[PDB]
């Protein structure tokens, strides 16, 4: 039993928590940011 738990836990997390996050960053993050209103305020440059 111990071997199986040690084996499946890493694999579970990579599938559900890390790879779903990478796919989010590459595929959707751009659309989520653009879809916010007032892109002018969103992209104001620092005074510096």
């Amino acid at each position: 039993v111990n071997k199986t738990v040690r084996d499946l836990m890493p694999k579970t997390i990579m599938h559900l928590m890390i790879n779903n996050t990478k796919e989010f960053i590459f595929s959707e993050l751009l659309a989520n940011l653009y879809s916010c209103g007032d892109q002018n305020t969103l992209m104001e440059e620092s005074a510096e």
Partner: protein, 49 residues
């Protein structure tokens, strides 16, 4: 009535296939339902992607 009562306890299989197809389309048709011939925001984000 005899035919209707013959497909019961079979429908679950049809429901799973119909639900599976809807899941692979629904993620895409959201753009189509609100499609407009004039949408500079839709065009801009499509360009960036």
């Amino acid at each position: 009535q005899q035919l209707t009562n013959h497909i019961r306890d079979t429908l679950p299989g049809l429901r799973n296939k119909l639900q599976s197809q809807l899941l692979s389309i629904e993620k895409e048709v959201e753009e189509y339902k609100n499609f407009r011939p004039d949408d500079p925001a839709r065009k801009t984000k499509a360009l960036l992607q």
